[PDB]
Design an enzyme around this catalytic site. Sequence first.
Site, mmCIF file in Angstrom:
data_model
loop_
_atom_site.group_PDB
_atom_site.id
_atom_site.type_symbol
_atom_site.label_atom_id
_atom_site.label_comp_id
_atom_site.label_asym_id
_atom_site.label_seq_id
_atom_site.Cartn_x
_atom_site.Cartn_y
_atom_site.Cartn_z
ATOM 1 N N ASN A 56 3.976 11.904 0.116
ATOM 2 C CA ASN A 56 4.346 11.210 -1.108
ATOM 3 C C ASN A 56 4.766 12.195 -2.188
ATOM 4 O O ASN A 56 5.404 11.809 -3.172
ATOM 5 C CB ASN A 56 3.187 10.339 -1.575
ATOM 6 C CG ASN A 56 2.881 9.226 -0.598
ATOM 7 O OD1 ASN A 56 3.783 8.612 -0.036
ATOM 8 N ND2 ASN A 56 1.601 8.977 -0.372
ATOM 9 N N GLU A 105 -3.862 -7.129 -1.681
ATOM 10 C CA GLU A 105 -5.240 -6.726 -1.460
ATOM 11 C C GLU A 105 -5.632 -5.677 -2.488
ATOM 12 O O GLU A 105 -4.811 -4.839 -2.878
ATOM 13 C CB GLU A 105 -5.440 -6.192 -0.034
ATOM 14 C CG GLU A 105 -4.570 -5.006 0.354
ATOM 15 C CD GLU A 105 -4.767 -4.588 1.800
ATOM 16 O OE1 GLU A 105 -5.606 -5.208 2.486
ATOM 17 O OE2 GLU A 105 -4.073 -3.652 2.252
ATOM 18 N N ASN A 135 9.057 8.357 7.855
ATOM 19 C CA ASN A 135 7.851 9.174 7.920
ATOM 20 C C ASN A 135 7.996 10.302 8.928
ATOM 21 O O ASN A 135 7.509 11.415 8.694
ATOM 22 C CB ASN A 135 6.645 8.318 8.288
ATOM 23 C CG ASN A 135 6.342 7.277 7.257
ATOM 24 O OD1 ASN A 135 6.390 6.083 7.539
ATOM 25 N ND2 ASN A 135 6.033 7.718 6.046
ATOM 26 N N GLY A 190 4.767 -2.945 6.256
ATOM 27 C CA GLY A 190 3.718 -3.837 5.819
ATOM 28 C C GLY A 190 4.234 -5.195 5.404
ATOM 29 O O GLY A 190 5.405 -5.370 5.083
ATOM 30 N N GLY A 191 3.333 -6.175 5.439
ATOM 31 C CA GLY A 191 3.717 -7.523 5.069
ATOM 32 C C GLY A 191 3.971 -7.660 3.584
ATOM 33 O O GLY A 191 4.794 -8.473 3.157
ATOM 34 N N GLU A 241 25.792 4.900 -12.235
ATOM 35 C CA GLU A 241 26.789 5.713 -11.551
ATOM 36 C C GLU A 241 26.486 5.862 -10.067
ATOM 37 O O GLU A 241 27.401 6.124 -9.283
ATOM 38 C CB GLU A 241 26.896 7.097 -12.192
ATOM 39 C CG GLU A 241 27.351 7.092 -13.629
ATOM 40 C CD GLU A 241 27.643 8.479 -14.158
ATOM 41 O OE1 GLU A 241 27.440 9.456 -13.410
ATOM 42 O OE2 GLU A 241 28.077 8.590 -15.322
ATOM 43 N N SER A 250 7.728 -0.587 1.460
ATOM 44 C CA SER A 250 7.955 -0.162 2.829
ATOM 45 C C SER A 250 8.572 -1.308 3.608
ATOM 46 O O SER A 250 8.649 -2.441 3.133
ATOM 47 C CB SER A 250 6.658 0.287 3.501
ATOM 48 O OG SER A 250 5.764 -0.800 3.641
ATOM 49 N N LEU A 287 21.917 5.689 -13.452
ATOM 50 C CA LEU A 287 21.636 4.836 -12.304
ATOM 51 C C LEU A 287 22.790 3.892 -12.013
ATOM 52 O O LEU A 287 22.991 3.480 -10.868
ATOM 53 C CB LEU A 287 20.351 4.041 -12.530
ATOM 54 C CG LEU A 287 19.025 4.629 -12.051
ATOM 55 C CD1 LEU A 287 18.661 5.908 -12.765
ATOM 56 C CD2 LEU A 287 17.937 3.594 -12.269
ATOM 57 N N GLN A 300 0.828 -1.201 0.000
ATOM 58 C CA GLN A 300 0.000 0.000 0.000
ATOM 59 C C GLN A 300 0.864 1.253 0.000
ATOM 60 O O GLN A 300 0.502 2.272 -0.599
ATOM 61 C CB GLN A 300 -0.939 -0.011 1.205
ATOM 62 C CG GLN A 300 -1.905 1.148 1.232
ATOM 63 C CD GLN A 300 -2.855 1.086 2.392
ATOM 64 O OE1 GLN A 300 -2.785 0.180 3.221
ATOM 65 N NE2 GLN A 300 -3.756 2.054 2.465
HETATM 66 N N1 LIG Z 1 5.704 7.680 2.998
HETATM 67 C C1 LIG Z 1 4.528 7.065 2.994
HETATM 68 N N2 LIG Z 1 4.376 5.894 3.697
HETATM 69 C C2 LIG Z 1 3.189 5.257 3.704
HETATM 70 C C3 LIG Z 1 2.118 5.773 3.009
HETATM 71 N N3 LIG Z 1 1.078 4.942 3.193
HETATM 72 C C4 LIG Z 1 1.469 3.917 3.980
HETATM 73 N N4 LIG Z 1 2.772 4.112 4.314
HETATM 74 C C5 LIG Z 1 3.619 3.242 5.134
HETATM 75 O O1 LIG Z 1 3.282 1.889 4.914
HETATM 76 C C6 LIG Z 1 3.621 1.160 6.068
HETATM 77 C C7 LIG Z 1 2.780 -0.098 6.189
HETATM 78 O O2 LIG Z 1 2.861 -0.812 4.982
HETATM 79 P P1 LIG Z 1 1.603 -0.874 3.991
HETATM 80 O O3 LIG Z 1 2.010 -0.463 2.600
HETATM 81 O O4 LIG Z 1 0.503 0.014 4.505
HETATM 82 O O5 LIG Z 1 1.108 -2.401 4.050
HETATM 83 P P2 LIG Z 1 1.542 -3.420 2.894
HETATM 84 O O6 LIG Z 1 2.947 -3.153 2.425
HETATM 85 O O7 LIG Z 1 0.550 -3.336 1.763
HETATM 86 O O8 LIG Z 1 1.497 -4.870 3.574
HETATM 87 P P3 LIG Z 1 0.147 -5.392 4.257
HETATM 88 O O9 LIG Z 1 0.354 -5.406 5.750
HETATM 89 O O10 LIG Z 1 -0.121 -6.794 3.771
HETATM 90 O O11 LIG Z 1 -1.003 -4.483 3.909
HETATM 91 C C8 LIG Z 1 3.383 2.112 7.217
HETATM 92 O O12 LIG Z 1 4.418 1.979 8.159
HETATM 93 C C9 LIG Z 1 3.430 3.493 6.613
HETATM 94 O O13 LIG Z 1 4.547 4.175 7.120
HETATM 95 C C10 LIG Z 1 2.265 6.952 2.300
HETATM 96 O O14 LIG Z 1 1.324 7.424 1.676
HETATM 97 N N5 LIG Z 1 3.474 7.599 2.291
HETATM 98 MG MG LIG Z 2 -1.322 -2.892 2.603
#
Ligand SMILES: Nc1nc2c(ncn2[C@@H]2O[C@H](COP(=O)(O)OP(=O)(O)OP(=O)(O)O)[C@@H](O)[C@H]2O)c(=O)[nH]1
Ligand SMILES: [Mg+2]
Lengths: 432, 432, 429, 429
Positions: free
Chosen positions: A219, A62, A197, A134-135, A245, A131, A243, A11
Amino acid sequence: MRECISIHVGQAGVQIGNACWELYCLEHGIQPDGQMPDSFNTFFSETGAGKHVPRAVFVDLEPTVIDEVRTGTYRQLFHPEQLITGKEDAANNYARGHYTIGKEIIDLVLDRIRKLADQCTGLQGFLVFHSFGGGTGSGFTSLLMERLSVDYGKKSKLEFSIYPAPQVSTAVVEPYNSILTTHTTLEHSDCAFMVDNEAIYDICRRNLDIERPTYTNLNRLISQIVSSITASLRFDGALNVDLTEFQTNLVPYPRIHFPLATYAPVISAEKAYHEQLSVAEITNACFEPANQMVKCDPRHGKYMACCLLYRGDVVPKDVNAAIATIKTKRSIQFVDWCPTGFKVGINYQPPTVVPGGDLAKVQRAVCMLSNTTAIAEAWARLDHKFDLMYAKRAFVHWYVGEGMEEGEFSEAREDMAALEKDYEEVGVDSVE
Amino acid sequence: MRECISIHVGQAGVQIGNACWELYCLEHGIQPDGQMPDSFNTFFSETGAGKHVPRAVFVDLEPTVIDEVRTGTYRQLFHPEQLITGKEDAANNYARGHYTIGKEIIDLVLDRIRKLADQCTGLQGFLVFHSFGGGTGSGFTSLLMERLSVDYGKKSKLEFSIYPAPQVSTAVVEPYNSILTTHTTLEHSDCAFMVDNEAIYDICRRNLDIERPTYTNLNRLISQIVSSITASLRFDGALNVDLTEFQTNLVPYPRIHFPLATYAPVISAEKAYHEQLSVAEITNACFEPANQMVKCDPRHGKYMACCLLYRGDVVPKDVNAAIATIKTKRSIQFVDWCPTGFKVGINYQPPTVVPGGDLAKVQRAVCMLSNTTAIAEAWARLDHKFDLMYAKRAFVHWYVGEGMEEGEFSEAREDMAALEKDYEEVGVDSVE
Amino acid sequence: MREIVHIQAGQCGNQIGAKFWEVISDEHGIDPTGSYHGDSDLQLERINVYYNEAAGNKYVPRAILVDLEPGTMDSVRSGPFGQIFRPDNFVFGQSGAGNNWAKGHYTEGAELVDSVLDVVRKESESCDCLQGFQLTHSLGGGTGSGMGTLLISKIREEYPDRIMNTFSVVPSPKVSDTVVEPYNATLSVHQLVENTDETYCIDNEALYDICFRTLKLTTPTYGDLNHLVSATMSGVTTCLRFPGQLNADLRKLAVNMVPFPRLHFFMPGFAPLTSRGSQQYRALTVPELTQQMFDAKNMMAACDPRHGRYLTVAAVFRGRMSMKEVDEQMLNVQNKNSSYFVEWIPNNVKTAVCDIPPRGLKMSATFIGNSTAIQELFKRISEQFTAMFRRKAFLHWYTGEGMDEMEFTEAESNMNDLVSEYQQYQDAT
Amino acid sequence: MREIVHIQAGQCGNQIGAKFWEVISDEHGIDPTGSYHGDSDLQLERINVYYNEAAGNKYVPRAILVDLEPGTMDSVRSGPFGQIFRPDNFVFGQSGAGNNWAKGHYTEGAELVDSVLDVVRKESESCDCLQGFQLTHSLGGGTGSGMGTLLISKIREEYPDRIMNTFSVVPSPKVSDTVVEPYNATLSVHQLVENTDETYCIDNEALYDICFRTLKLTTPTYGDLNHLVSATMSGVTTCLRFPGQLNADLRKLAVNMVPFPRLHFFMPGFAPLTSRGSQQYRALTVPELTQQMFDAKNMMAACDPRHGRYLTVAAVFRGRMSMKEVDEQMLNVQNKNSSYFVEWIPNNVKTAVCDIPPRGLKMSATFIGNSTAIQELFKRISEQFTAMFRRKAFLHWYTGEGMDEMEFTEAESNMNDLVSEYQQYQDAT
Ligand SMILES: Nc1nc2c(ncn2[C@@H]2O[C@H](COP(=O)(O)OP(=O)(O)OP(=O)(O)O)[C@@H](O)[C@H]2O)c(=O)[nH]1
Ligand SMILES: [Mg+2]
Ligand SMILES: Nc1nc2c(ncn2[C@@H]2O[C@H](COP(=O)(O)OP(=O)(O)OP(=O)(O)O)[C@@H](O)[C@H]2O)c(=O)[nH]1
Ligand SMILES: Nc1nc2c(ncn2[C@@H]2O[C@H](COP(=O)(O)OP(=O)(O)O)[C@@H](O)[C@H]2O)c(=O)[nH]1
Ligand SMILES: Nc1nc2c(ncn2[C@@H]2O[C@H](COP(=O)(O)OP(=O)(O)O)[C@@H](O)[C@H]2O)c(=O)[nH]1
Ligand SMILES: [Mg+2]
């Protein structure tokens, strides 16, 4: 001709690309319908009609964040086979991203990459947006970076990760997902750019004078980073940088490849005036510790390699006049083995402003990509968040029951301990 | 001048031709009334008025699917003596198609063929549309292919069969009808093109993004195959190919003459954009195993001869640039005795789109006709479906009571066993 | 072409057919008089299979209604759609069968059967190319068991190459409706195995459950049961009367569903079956119609299919639907229930799709199941037969009508020759 | 995708769900009939998780309403939003549980549970990719305790990889509402610890305080209590039904909030909660919604969190708000109350933000707290259990229904195995 495709995992990865591909379409005059009323070839493959589509793979387990792209403004822009959805998310479970759910569509994602790589003639590398929390961004990325190093190997794979903050967390098992995703991406990813963040919360409050910043606004700042890195590809500059470099100038050892990005100027419209913004002014802003985008104190560490990517109305003599002062300053210190700790890039094109954006129109900018010893304090926290949770075996049954061995955590922790003593080995000076 | 008549046997054969002759009338500007407000001579004999009628024989033992043509849109197109009906269907009984009911009108069908062959001056061959499942498409075709090889012999008789799927069946005695119809059509038919329903179910769901495909929609894709094979006759091409050339390039041994068709691009209107569809893009789509139209895995076998029939905006140098890459790829392997496994055809005319169709308007297309070792897995299933049913003597009294000997099944099974070991004899490499 | 002569025997066979010709006349848009009043020419395209065209643009049903007492025919000819039949076809006696097989097959049946076959031969020669004869009767009664199975043995000698499908109402497990129904059933199944190409076993106990459980009818009459039988009966030949995307007929259902010529005893099923309130709360899709058929509580023969294995399965669908959506579901029930289907018949599902739906429905299905589950149907009757016959109970009502005990000894051995065959191909590997 | 089958057991589970499907139908703009009447396509974007699409553009709730007496279902089907459910789903018995766990789990429950699971299996196969099952019941009653925990043990065997979250109304400290509620609770918690991935303990005494103190309702009925439960229930899955800036679901709340697989007993909280007059005198900001959650008087489980330590904390927010304003306040409550959170879980706050607010509100929160404070919830019940069991009081109403004393000895030891675990990880360093 120097094509570069991008992957968006989780996400966090999709919502970053929702601002990034918003930004790229404004830099090239591209409508959201793919229309424009020859330098865009590094991201936009061309169709038979006058319609350009992006070289992007949006993947999530998802379908919610993908369907908002499918129903948003950029419905007509993206190739709908590139918008890949699973059914159930990994759901902050690294094992579900890497073993359970991630294996179900990993062959679908590699198929969509391989269809993009065939229509690229000069493919340089990858831009994986994910990130550490998230998982999906942990498990599915680490599954994906295993496969791309098998299928390609020599391409320069870049990551733009959302590093977990020290005191600001959104999930409880962020110390589990971050350690597990780094043990796998270490031997595969060439250079992973940390972004935090909490540091952008500091920048959007102080430097932008915004009381209430949104994930929309965070973002935008990450999009200005990735645009300025690929500004030398997408535009002709006075001194260009590829890239390939970046991994050469910034990675002294194959373990240490974790720089932290920093953008400047970050000022609002009311502060767009009241200062002249020379290249001396915007360069001292970057090495100021309050303006970085990872919550680390660079005065507590040493820089190993700094990469200043200027763009816009930039004069190369005033560049040297700005940079040579910083080596004299005591607060910026380098490591003893590195007398030349600089890579300088200049582009002729200014960064444009997205309408509805919080940044103001500036004649020049800088994206600092600095690899430092001060990130070792960030890993010292994250093992300390790991060692408190794992000693009581908290949350392990969520990971063991999804195919992972309990002994695999001891493999990831001892390896991260080996990564932690690498910065202590590099951070010391040389004998004789 | 190079005339080619077509025969449509069974309910499957007629409903295919209902889309095929729908397609041919749109490619030549022909109204359903036979009107048009010199290259059409290969399928349309001309009357004294400005009305053209097709060189087609529609035959069924039951009158239902014929009467829907007699009352449909194309009532005014077909010669009503060509629309041949029986009274009772063969009704999934090979013996009733070959002995009981089929003998009653076989002299009527051969009479209608011989009236068509006399008004042809350059008759090349036959296009028999039938299935392997139904009793008419099995019994009456095998009765008909005996008679056409007696009366003509040297004409190039082509079959377009609906091969029974591994897990998708519509009739119970499909393993009986398919073995019996192949024992007879083996020594008579020159090249029988296998088409499967389940693979088009896979293509219409995935590639066309249709949730609910109809037998209307499956017959559109088979019509695009048969049109692209006879595109070199009906239109002037940069590199033409006759029906006599297909049996030469694709049939290494008189037993093995069962290629499997594959069409590309199969994309919808929303995916008509978002890709450029080069000749490199549409050729790699064909050798991809998910896009073939027989449920077989070509990675489990070897190709013996591939036939790429391009049409439309096709550049012959980019053809060689597309094809020479595929011989380098490991997933496409050939047999050791065949270094030249390719026949390439190019037509200037694009495939047009039928209104109400699910395919989109594309500038170029490809009908791959590939003879492979991977069809031996399909016959290994079909004997295994035969050997389980026949060992208990299931359904044999329906076939013995209609004039067939019980020992004739042992003749067809041992011959199919001899056909199965032919692919194992060809599929191995050569000594020294 | 492919015309069908409908024959009705017994009180039950008349009351089914009087509801059956109500459904056919509504599908083809036929008035109470006999004149066409539909909308499309598809109703008149294949009108000739169940109708002769009379003068004055009227259609008469090709039906032969047989009874041994005039009580049922007077209910037919005076009710609705009784003025459509030809008065020549009502061939009824006066004595009545007396709920007796011997009086139906030997004494009072033979005094009428020559006046029936001359009407059969009159209707058969009026057919252009005859498809075959469908018979509606019971196995518990006297006329439907005696006069019905006497008609089959005379017709199969005269017309051997035609199909002879019977819709036999087989007696119920829980209740009886006739004291001598194990005698009427076993003496009729002796005649069904030798002269019928297929036979559709329907039980009244099963329709009592379907009207109560599935349709939520608290008070179902016979007119509500027979509308469920006639929905099967029109659903068997719906692809013969209308264009479909995969047409079947009575010979396709004969060849595909009868692996061994004795084992032609089927169980029917119909779908959808919804209540008045419970129909708007349900999506009518092909996966819904599929899973409604293959369970236990939608079988019109009172036996659970889970006690045996399906040998062959036919699913005749009606209405515009997509073939992949069909062919996935016909595969889907075979994967998850692979122990429930017989193994040595791979892909034992016959598919048929008619384009024309029933009246007032978007889509509909007609299930034809040939299972080993009806061995319990004949294990029960042969147990009820042998319990009565070992005391020679009610024997003198049949011995007095020209029958010996050797007729029972052959008929009971023939059914145990049938039960041992379903047990043979259930244990077959 | 990710569909949820809602199951209701007991009188309480029906009256919660009858208010719960009132909230969901108002969020998605659904009429009393079942047809969509909202304004945006975001309501129909994820409509399929709690609804099947029926024919005629109507939606039926994917709900299975179970009771052992018909008294509660007749209140459901005749009231408002009772005509939206499918009449097939109302699976009710006649005998009634008699406020008995043994009659709900062994005798009268087992005579109905096979007719429930066939409706469960029917709704589960209608789902595209099933997310998991939510159950609403009590622990004091007989049907919600007996038939409810019988459904969990049968489903987890059939669907082990799915989540099984229960909304268990746990009995109160001050008052009882059932004499044998220490027997009904302890025999159900034996079934909850082995077969539920999470469980939301709600107390009626706590909702009595929140309606009186916080909402200033002098006369709250059950319909006013259940609107506070359903505001939590829709707030748990609000990120699954709508786009958010940080999406959660039932598996994210499962993994983040359950550090040990037994310790999955939660306390919920909702914010904002204001009176009629007292809502215009208050600024609805994220620091106001934050401090309203983490106190004692907004916990729906009657235990003060100050007596223990929070293990894990989830805060699911609704409405357009800024993430820094969220992430500061989630940090702010952790700094000033560092003794109140457990130490060896650093950063134990789960954050989720949905973009769509509730109806008529600018922003809203949904607190999910997993504390050691519910050890006093089980210290009290196990004390009330052991006081009754040591005299063997009311034992013959359960021993007469097939149960022995060994069932109680295991269930009481299992709860003291649970209390000793919360005491273990409260004293853990
Ligand atoms: N910089 C930034 N970070 C975001 C944003 N939205 C979510 N995050 C980060 O995403 C992290 C959690 O990972 P997610 O992307 O929400 O979840 P996922 O990677 O889809 O994995 P799942 O748990 O299966 O949903 C959080 O710690 C947030 O810091 C965003 O709009 N900008
Ligand atoms: Mg997610
Ligand atoms: N590709 C395709 N196949 C069809 C179509 N219609 C029917 N079939 C196939 O036809 C096979 C059965 O043969 P039919 O043509 O229906 O029967 P028949 O050949 O007339 O022989 P009879 O049994 O006597 O009716 C089935 O296995 C279907 O796969 C169609 O529209 N398209
Ligand atoms: N399904 C159905 N069965 C019936 C009906 N009427 C009678 N039967 C059955 O017919 C059997 C009696 O046969 P019947 O025709 O009355 O005796 P017959 O006239 O001597 O042949 C009983 O077992 C009933 O179950 C009816 O309306 N519907
Ligand atoms: N929150 C809430 N709890 C209720 C309601 N009605 C009953 N209860 C609780 O349910 C418990 C009784 O369970 P009940 O469902 O009536 O018994 P059962 O039908 O045998 O399961 C009591 O302890 C009540 O506290 C209600 O409307 N709201
Ligand atoms: Mg046919």
